Amino acid sequence: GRMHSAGKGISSSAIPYSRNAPAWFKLSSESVIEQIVKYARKGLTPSQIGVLLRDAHGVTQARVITGNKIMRILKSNGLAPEIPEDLYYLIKKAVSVRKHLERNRKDKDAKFRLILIESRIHRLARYYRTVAVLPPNWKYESATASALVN
Amino acid sequence: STELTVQSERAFQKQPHIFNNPKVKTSKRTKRWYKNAGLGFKTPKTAIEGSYIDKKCPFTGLVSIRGKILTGTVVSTKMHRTIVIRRAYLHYIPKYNRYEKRHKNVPVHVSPAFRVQVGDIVTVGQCRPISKTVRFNVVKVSAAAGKANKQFAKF
Amino acid sequence: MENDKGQLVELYVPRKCSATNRIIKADDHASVQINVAKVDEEGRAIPGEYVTYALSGYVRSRGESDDSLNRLAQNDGLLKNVWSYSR
Amino acid sequence: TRSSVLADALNAINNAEKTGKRQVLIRPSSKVIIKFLQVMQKHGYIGEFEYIDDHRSGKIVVQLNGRLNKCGVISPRFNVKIGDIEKWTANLLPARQFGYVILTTSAGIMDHEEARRKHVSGKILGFVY
Amino acid sequence: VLVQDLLHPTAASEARKHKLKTLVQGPRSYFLDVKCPGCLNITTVFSHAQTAVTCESCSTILCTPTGGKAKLSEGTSFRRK
Amino acid sequence: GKGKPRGLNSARKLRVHRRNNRWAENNYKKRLLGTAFKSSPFGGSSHAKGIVLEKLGIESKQPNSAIRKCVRVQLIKNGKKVTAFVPNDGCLNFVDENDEVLLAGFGRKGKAKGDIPGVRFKVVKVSGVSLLALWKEKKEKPRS
RNA sequence: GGAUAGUGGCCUACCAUGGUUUCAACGGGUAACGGGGAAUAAGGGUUCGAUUCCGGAGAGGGAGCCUGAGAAACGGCUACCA
RNA sequence: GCGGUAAUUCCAGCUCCAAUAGCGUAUAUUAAAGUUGUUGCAGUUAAAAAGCUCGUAGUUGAACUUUGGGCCCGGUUGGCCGGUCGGAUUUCCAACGGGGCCUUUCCUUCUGGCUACCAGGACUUUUACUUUGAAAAAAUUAGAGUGUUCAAAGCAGGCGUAUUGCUCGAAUAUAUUAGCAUGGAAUAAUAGAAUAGGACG
RNA sequence: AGGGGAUCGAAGAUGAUCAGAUACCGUCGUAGUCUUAACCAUAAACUAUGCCGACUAGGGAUCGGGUGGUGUUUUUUUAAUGACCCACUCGGCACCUUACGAGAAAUCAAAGUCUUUGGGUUCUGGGGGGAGUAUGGUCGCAAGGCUGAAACUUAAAGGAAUUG
């Protein structure tokens, strides 16, 4: 548990036993699917949105109130990004680390984490290529990474 | 490979003893002999519809399939009108009562009936010696895509 | 411990811990047999008439002999209240 | 991580009857755990077990009488062919008369004695006594 | 110890345990319908905040997040469901 | 979990690891190095004949004091000088020098036998007449 | 195409850039012919097999060849080296 | 470990032990050896965890998808009776397995042949495993038979009407990894419909 | 290779000491000690103790986070706090008592779930010495790092505990 550290922590979300639920929620799939896509229009992430519709509005889990998950809906709606968001913030993070490194190469612990972060990046891509969400030959490139974040 | 020129060799390429009479005017031009290799194997349409020549093609050629018949996946398409397949298989070590992964790389002449790609499993019938390496001949192609379509453009 | 035909052989069919259903063998010297007296109307205890249990050496050493008999006796009728099967 | 679920379950079982306990929680159940527990139950080494329902893999509560000495998994699932079932038994089973080597065959998870009579074999699974 | 009911454990000793480690895992958070009579009606908020919510009409603060459940700003009522 | 790999498919890693490790087994090693044929004074054979160079009394290690009559021998087939021991009482008066002695090991597979150090061999026959039969009276040493 | 009894880079012309390998290629060693089999007797294993049967090689070392259905023969020839 | 002056170990006589036409020895080898450890090792201090993390090959890798139920047919051993001339079979009773139906349910599909496979067309996601079989040299080995006078052997021989012949034998089993054929569908891989380039007609 | 260079201080200089005293102690003091840029890759680099996963037992403390409380403090005035208390729960640095178990023992909550022997996997070791030597390959500017035999030799070396 926790590949790149000794971290044994158990921290997660405990998903409920009720598969339909809550029984107190009105509105409908039309209302939330419309609600999803306006925030995707704004540019929020399935992680950012599902929280937003958890806190502000009345969605316990959007996977239920609509028979599809959040990203699958964005995909069908053309609002899907070209690379998944976990991979995005993986690459987006290493872009900032190596950025701090060009400022100070004296910092060894930074040079160290950059290995672990980039290891994880190459692992995700390898899987994403296996399942064909990214083309075969998709590779994480150092200098071409700053251009994929922005 | 193949896939054009039909004549590209300094030798005039033709089927043996299949004669097109010039005086007898035909609108099909070529008269093209074929057979079905047997062993419950479809002689494919492109072997008939095709314009090609090759005599090592078990459907239109003078080689006959007999003996072993083998499954294996294509690791190399790099040769023109032949290919190499990796048939893996497991080996049992009696002492340890376990298995170890092995493989054997089989060159096999691919008739220009088939479009073969790397990664496609292939069925292969045994034939007379063809080249130095090749004792076997492509017969049936078991994979028509092998993930080819799932790679797609953005939108 | 029977045989070819019929007869029971092999001396000494051993006891069992009533709590854990474990064979209690000759050398288990922390093993124990409890004799609980069955009384009659007006509280007199009827000497020689017993509800008995055997408790393995293991259960006593672990500290479970107390809670084991409490379970073992109450469901046998000698008590109520006290022990809860659920926790 | 987790490799043999069945092994994990046959553990807490043996870790129960070594501590004396008559009830053990196991997670995350299985298809094989079921059929193995079944074979254990039907020959009398456990009581009744209840698969409970979470929405993931489930749990199980197994009641064990104490008649059991050792249950356990054979970790690699070994091919055994009909003539080696004897060989396999003689190693881990206390005496000829009782105990069961239980395994998996194309005819279903079953012990060697049931295997003998049906006369099919398969890969090994575990053992119970 | 040595005998206890695993199938039917006490809900009182259950609710002390960790959300994952109960007999069946489930979330312990809640949903409240929260009121600022400066608005006639309610926006329904999740208990452990993150996003610090506004009411549909005016820009106004219901909660601010913490690690756990949110600080409900100043006067509000709430209905749990 | 006793790091030997358990896998049903780990056969190679299993049989390789043991092949790798038999080198720690000693005379497994000596088997495949050919050390019998390569080094050691005998060819890798039971006995070997040779010729006496000198008669050397060896003083035995503690807690013993003796003078153990031995012979520097040069192996015919081989050419190695090797130093061997003469058994029982006298028996050094049966050899002298330039003689042809049959040697055997000491029965320890190398590894000198006794308070006699560094001597791995023993005299069996001299002049082909079998030191026993000379020590008892059964034979006498050949004329010349 | 030549050649062979015949297939085949067997050889030859033009042509292609291919074929093997950490699933150990390639290389080095073998006091290595391989198999039937042999010893040691919980099982599992370990060790050996020049040698009475089968298969393969060779007739001092190499090549070459005649005769013939059949030999690259050696109790056939020709040459070399010994 | 014996021997430097009373030697239970040397050299001898006497006696006694072990095996016995045999016994000693050197060398290899197997068992002893769970001291090579798949079965089946040890690794804190005896020999032995890389200074630390990453990471390719290798080994390995959570759970879930036909469950349960109802109705037939046919087998082989076991009893309680036996009917009978030691075995004979039907009913009573179990015990283990095999096949087939229906409960929403292809074992490929059509065209007839026939009453279960004929042969022909058209197609079929591919594996590991486990069953059974066919094909498998003798000798060797395990082993039935046979009184080489015993025996290792050998595969002979054994019976009268031994003056004109009769006649049982020369079994069986083992053979494995791969190959072929076949019953199995558990465990474990593998492929499928998602920008539908989807399935059926 | 520059800078820096207070202090301490391998070399070296010495004063004492001893039979000797190239030392211990005293005294001076070069390199060093710091730093910039490049090298080096070793330590008893230690928990002399692989990583992932399941399970097996009580107890009070403690670190960080979170949950509950008609709990105590502050007060300015309920509040809001902020520290404190009590209980629960995850994840941590540890500690006590135990011994169902383990072990040669010292001791171990793992070193337990092992002849009733199988969760996944990496690494190492196979009497002592010769020896971490020779050799070859490779890394380094160098010192050195890595990999790494054999001949021969030898009955013990060795671990924990026990009594003297």
Ligand SMILES: CN[C@@H]1[C@@H](O)[C@@H](O[C@@H]2[C@@H](O)[C@H](O[C@H]3O[C@H](CN)CC[C@H]3N)[C@@H](N)C[C@H]2N)OC[C@]1(C)O
């Ligand atoms: C602390 N170092 C240890 C070393 O001491 C030793 O440890 C073993 C340990 O592996 C065995 O345990 C192992 O085998 C068990 C089988 N019953 C279960 C799995 C595993 N824990 C223990 N039974 C004995 C220890 N001394 O072997 C493994 C190791 C990691 O090197």
Ligand SMILES: [Mg+2]
């Ligand atoms: Mg990790």
Ligand SMILES: [Mg+2]
């Ligand atoms: Mg990792």
Ligand SMILES: [Mg+2]
């Ligand atoms: Mg965890």
Ligand SMILES: [Mg+2]
């Ligand atoms: Mg065993």
Ligand SMILES: [Mg+2]
């Ligand atoms: Mg290797």
Ligand SMILES: [Mg+2]
């Ligand atoms: Mg080596």
Ligand SMILES: [Mg+2]
């Ligand atoms: Mg070593």
Ligand SMILES: [Mg+2]
């Ligand atoms: Mg020799």
Ligand SMILES: [Mg+2]
């Ligand atoms: Mg001299």
Ligand SMILES: [Mg+2]
């Ligand atoms: Mg000595």
Ligand SMILES: [Mg+2]
């Ligand atoms: Mg001689």
Ligand SMILES: [Mg+2]
């Ligand atoms: Mg030819």
Ligand SMILES: [Mg+2]
């Ligand atoms: Mg040779």
Ligand SMILES: [Mg+2]
């Ligand atoms: Mg050999």
Ligand SMILES: [Mg+2]
């Ligand atoms: Mg063999």
